[PDB]
Amino acid sequence: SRPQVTVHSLTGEATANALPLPAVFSAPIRPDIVHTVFTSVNKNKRQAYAVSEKAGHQTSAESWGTGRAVARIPRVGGGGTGRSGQGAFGNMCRGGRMFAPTKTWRKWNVKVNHNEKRYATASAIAATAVASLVLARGHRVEKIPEIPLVVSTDLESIQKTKEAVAALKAVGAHSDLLKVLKSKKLRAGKGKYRNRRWTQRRGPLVVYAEDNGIVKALRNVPGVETANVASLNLLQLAPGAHLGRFVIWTEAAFTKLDQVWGSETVASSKVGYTLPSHIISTSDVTRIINSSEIQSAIRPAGQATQKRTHVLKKNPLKNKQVLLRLNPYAKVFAAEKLGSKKA
Amino acid sequence: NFVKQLSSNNRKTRVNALEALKKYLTAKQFKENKQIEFNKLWKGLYYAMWFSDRPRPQQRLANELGELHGLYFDPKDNSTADELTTNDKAFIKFSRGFWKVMCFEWFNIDRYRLDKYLLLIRRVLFSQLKYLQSRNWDKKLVDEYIKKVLRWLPLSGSPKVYTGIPIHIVDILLDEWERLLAKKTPLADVIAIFQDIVADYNNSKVLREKIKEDLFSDTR
Amino acid sequence: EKILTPESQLKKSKAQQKTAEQVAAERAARKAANKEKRAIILERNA
Amino acid sequence: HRTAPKSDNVYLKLLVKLYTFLARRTDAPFNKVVLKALFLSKINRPPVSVSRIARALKQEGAANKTVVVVGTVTDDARIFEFPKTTVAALRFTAGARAKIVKAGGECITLDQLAVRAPKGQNTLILRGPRN
Amino acid sequence: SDEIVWQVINQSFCSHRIKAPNGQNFCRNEYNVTGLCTRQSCPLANSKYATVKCDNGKLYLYMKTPERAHTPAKLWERIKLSKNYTKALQQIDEHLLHWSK
RNA sequence: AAGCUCGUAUCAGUUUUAUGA
RNA sequence: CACGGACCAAGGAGUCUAACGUCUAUGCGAGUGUUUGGGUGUAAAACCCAUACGCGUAAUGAAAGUGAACGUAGGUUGGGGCCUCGCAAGAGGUGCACAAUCGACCGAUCCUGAGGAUGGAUUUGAGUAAGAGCAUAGCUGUUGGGACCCGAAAG
């Protein structure tokens, strides 16, 4: 059994009701999988682009031939136009056809394993209930009551945007909704004149079990995205392949998440799917290393930085003092002279 | 239940849940059987320490979690060559589950809260230990209780127990032995268990050499 | 009441002392061994 | 010579991070064998079948050993009987995991094995068929 | 846990790092002691974390307990640090009893 | 380049003795 | 020798795809592969899935067939490791993958001829030793596509 999660009301008060953790939040948080799945999935909603098949071939040029004291690039015929006697059919030429004309049949969409794709979303959900991971990702979540944040089911029934934003402001997502709206900037590229004019930060996800006007209530407040628990998009959950979006769950959604994914007790609802096993027992190493156990079967410690044994070469013959650490007889040799000896 | 009130996220309902567990433990007519209920009680008390972070209230909480072996089956009935009569029969089921909880938990405790459970298991070994009974002698309590210490936590012929908790019991049972206040007690049979661990091969060296230095090297 | 040392840090002091008293005794029995070694080297050079 | 793992699974990097510590501090040649084995690629970590674990426990005086597969433990439908033994591995397949638990024994991770056997007492390291 | 928090922000984004031309990394999470960021010198990766800050002239020492991993609303417990230097360093010491040096 | 045994007595643009045309 | 260079700006050349591999990573694993499709969707995204099919899971042959335990799926020798003794140095035991040696089962041999029984003669094998694949992605090779770019006498 898990700790358990308190559900807050629309006034931002802790109701006596508590919900068990769905055990999806005990999935392996895998940054490498989320990255290598996101990059493939972000390619899918993408259109084709190609240069025209006729472009560059809509010229009637002819190569002038050998020994004409001029470069052998195919030149346009005719006369008295300016375009006559100049280069066509060439990647280097002006008005010429580009090297490797981009064709439509490029691999636009990416095939992914269905199980790997499911792993990624489970990891992405697991990272939403960490609080430090959410803070690192962005999301001003300092003044929010608990993580993972679960609001009462009456949040779904809200029709008017004014009341719906008042629910979030009472909860504590006020700062995150002020991060967005203040972060509205012009696109820095040619994206301005390609219908990608404005760019802003991502706000909270609002996950509901079933809609009673919540999808429409929040579709105007900037940054706020909603998702039905049955779906739960990876592109929403881990935006830019960065883990841990600030997710406001609802009471009914949080209970349904047990059914949707599965645990030890409940089945799965996805055909022949189980949540993946950890290849470690504990996600932290230092409890294992700084144990009573391991530190008992271990040889004594060093200094973390060696004391420098012989740093510079002092020479004997000169420097009297080092000539006494080598050969203690040199004291006796000096006292009796010994080199100065009579026969 | 109490597993939702001792493992709450609120401080006041966990303190009030402890006080309703004090009344629930002095209501002895309902705690008659069902081992796994006691296991769930120690898992709820495990979380009930796990939400306490500050040092003074976690020491007060460790002292009263040890004291829960004192309110539950206080010594006053003080049985005479009475084998296990409603103060000693059910008590052992309240002990084993605790160690079972720690036998389940020694992976899942991080490097910052593990001092709370070293100190907790110090207080609880001192408290069961203090409730052999009010005197340190009750003989079928000694061999049945020592069978339901020997057969779970210093097994040391089974790798299922985590090797840090017997070496911690070796580190604590001498000073917490003589917190009971040179007398003669059933100590040596306890020490015979450790001699059994030195007699037991097919183990790791740490249990074999760390008790063989730490426990036997004491001049007391 | 009053605050107490953590039962990892309590162990630390104990195991440090165990190693330190060993190390000091090992060091002290090496100064004497090197002194005796010095005397052997002196008479060999003679 | 191989220095670091090519893997990007950070949990495998945590095991390397653990077993590099136990490689130099224990000075027992068990840990050096495991830490070398973690660096190996996916073709060079072949899956040890549950049948090869059963064959390995027929070994005389190996009734109370904790068998350690650095690769993956996989299920075999052909065999019926399986001893009560502690098996340590990276990946237990759902079928194999169920087979060991129902037989009586445990299926444990490599860090659990690092706790229970730091120097590596009373163990056996199996390898899958490469050729 | 926290090792998993660290590795995911060591690389794979701590979205408040400044890469200086010196190759140095600076966490601007207002609650860190060293302005630089490293393992258990930045306040997200570590679970036990102390810091001195100032809101007014009043210099508080904030403190983060792993008890409060559930609730980020009241993470940093804070204590005023008199005003005289000598008694304040002594005030500091008592709070830091039985921590990392 | 990688994997496998080994870390050796595995050898060497060398000298020497030994034994033939 | 010779071919290129008056100077300056901008343009300008190993690309994309299919077929078949290499190695590495990831998922699962005797299985594996959602995306032809259907359901659903805040809509070319994401999220679910029926029946099939693809490749692999049990081999020995030429028309006709048969079928893998004398077995801790072997006897020995080694053989990473581990255990006992020893302060060590060593010795002994158990020995993974793998290698060497002696063989067996199965099919196929040279005969014996009760349509081919039966016993002997021997070897043989991408044979069984007791499964390692499938899919995605990256790195890259091979060949075809205009195929690194430009340049020829043509029908």
The domain ranges of chain B are 1-220
Compute the nearest-CA separation of C11 from chain B (Å). 8
A291 touches chain C (CB under 8 A): no
Q: A62 with A74: CB under 8 angstroms?
A: yes
What does the radius of gyration of chain B's CA atoms come to, in whole angstroms?
Answer: 17
CA B183/CA A245 separation, integer angstroms? 63
C5–E contact, CB cutoff 8 A: yes
B and A interact (at least 3 Cβ pairs within 8 A): yes
Strand G–CB A69 distance below 7 A: no
User: Is chain A adjacent to chain C, meaning 3+ CB pairs within 8 angstroms?
Assistant: yes
Cα angle C30-A296-B150, degrees, rounded to a multiple of 5: 135
3-state secondary structure of A117: helix
Question: Residues 153-182, chain B: which have Cβ within 8 Å of C?
Answer: 168, 171-172
Query: Neighbours of A (≥3 Cβ pairs closer than 8 A)?
Result: B, C, D, E
* Minimum CA–CA partner of D112 in chain B: B107
B123 φψ region: left (φ > 0), alpha (ψ -120 to 50), beta (else): alpha
The single-letter DSSP state of residue A50 is -
Sort residue D15 into left (φ over 0), alpha (ψ -120 to 50) or beta.
alpha
Question: Residue A227: which H helix or E strand, with range?
Answer: strand A225-228
Q: Is the CB of D40 under 7 A from strand F?
A: yes
Nearest to E30 by CA among E8, E10, E11, E52: E52
- Burial of residue A268 (CB within 10 Å: 0-12, 13-18, 19+) is middle
Instruction: With residue A207 as reference, give the H or E element that holds it.
Output: strand A205-208
Proximity of residue D58 CB to strand F below 7 A: no
Per the rule left: phi > 0, alpha: psi between -120 and 50, beta: everything else, E40 is: left
Which chain E residues are closer than 8 Å to A128 by Cβ? Answer: none
User: Please, what sign has the CA dihedral across residues C21, C27, C33, C39?
Assistant: negative
Cα dihedral E45, E49, E52, E55, rounded to 10, equals 70
Put simply, whether B108 touches E (Cβ < 8 Å) is no
D64 touches strand G (CB under 7 A): no
Chain D nearest-CA distance from B161, in A, is 9
CA distances from A302 to A307, D21, D131 (A): 10, 13, 44
CATH number for the domain running over E3-101 = 3.30.390.110
Query: CATH number of the domain that D62 lies in?
Result: 3.100.10.10
Query: Chain A contacts of B49, Cβ < 8 Å?
Result: none
Interface probe with D: pick from E2, E5, E7, most Cβ of D within 10 Å: E7
Q: Which of D91, A112, A35, A202 is nearest to E8 (CA)?
A: A35
Chains C and D touch (3+ CB pairs under 8 A): no
Q: How far is Cα D55 from Cα D115, in angstroms, rounded to an integer?
A: 26
Type and span of the H or E element at D53: helix D50-56
The verdict on a CB contact (< 8 Å) between B119 and C11 is: no
- Residue A18 phi/psi, 5-degree rounding, is -135, 145
Q: How far is A301 from chain D (nearest CA, A)?
A: 8
Query: What are residue A7's phi and psi, to 5 degrees?
Result: -95, 130
User: Residue B57 has which token pair?
Assistant: 């209230």
CA distance A65 to D16: 68
> What helix, strand, coil percent values describe chain A, rounded to 5?
30, 10, 60
Which is it for strands A75-76 and A61-62: parallel, antiparallel or unpaired? Answer: antiparallel
- Return positions of chain F under 7 A from a protein CB: 2-4
Number of other CB atoms surrounding residue A70 within 10 Å: 10
Stated in angstroms to one decimal place, the resolution of this structure is 3.2
Measured between alpha carbons, how far apart are the two ends of chain A, in Å?
Answer: 98
- What is the C-alpha to C-alpha distance for residues A259 and A24, in angstroms, rounded to an integer? 11
Buried b (16+ CB within 10 A) or exposed e, A323-334: beeeeebbeeee
Q: What is the DSSP string of A55-76?
A: TTTSS-EE---SSSSS--SPEE
Residue C5: list chain E partners with CB under 8 A. 98
Q: What is the DSSP letter of B145?
A: H
* Cβ partners under 8 Å of residue B215, min gap 6: B170, B174, B191, B194
- Give one word for A223, left, alpha or beta, with left for phi > 0 and alpha for psi -120 to 50: left
D44 touches strand F (CB under 7 A): yes
CA distance B42 to B28: 17
Could you tell me the two tokens for D60?
Answer: 């005389």
List for chain D the helix, strand, coil content (%; round to 5).
Answer: 40, 20, 45
Decide: helix, strand or coil at residue D45.
coil
SS3 A330: helix
The answer to whether residues D25 and A298 touch, using CB atoms and an 8 Å cutoff, is yes
Residue A106, CB, less than 7 Å from strand G? yes
Q: Determine the distance in angstroms separating the CA of E10 from the nearest CA of chain C, rounded to an integer.
A: 28
- Residues on chain B touching D118 (C-beta within 8 angstroms): 204, 206
Two tokens at D57?
A: 């426990």
Single-letter code of the amino acid located at B38: F
DSSP secondary structure string, D86-101? -EEEEEE-HHHHHHHH
Provide the 3-class DSSP secondary structure of residue E59: strand
As a whole number of angstroms, the distance between CA B125 and CA B109 comes to 19
Element (H, E) at D66: strand D66-74
CB contact under 8 A, C6 and E98: yes
How far apart CA B158 and CA A95 sit, in angstroms, is 82
DSSP label of A184: -
Strands of A247-250's sheet, edge to edge?
Answer: A14-19, A5-8, A150-151, A247-250, A205-208, A225-228
With CA atoms as reference, the chain D residue closest to B205 would be D121
Q: Tell me which chain E residues have a C-beta less than 8 angstroms from the C-beta of C9.
A: 98
Which of D's residues 101-120 have CB atoms within 7 A of nucleic strand G?
Answer: 119-120
Cα distance between residue A269 and residue B180, in whole Å: 57
- In this complex, the answer to whether residue D60 has its CB under 7 A from any atom of chain G, a nucleic strand, is yes
- Domain hosting D119: range is 1-131
CB B68 within 8 A of CB B120: no
Helix (H, G, I), strand (E, B) or coil at E78: strand
Chain C residues near residue A332 by CB distance under 8 angstroms? 42, 46
Contact A53, A41 (CB under 8 A): no
Residues 6+ apart with CB under 8 A from A71: A87
Cα–Cα dist D13/A55, whole Å? 53
**Bridge pairing between strands A150-151 and A247-250:** parallel
Query: What span, in angstroms and rounded, lies between the C-alpha atoms of D64 and B27?
Result: 46
Burial group, residue A107, by CB count within 10 angstroms (0-12, 13-18, 19+) = exposed
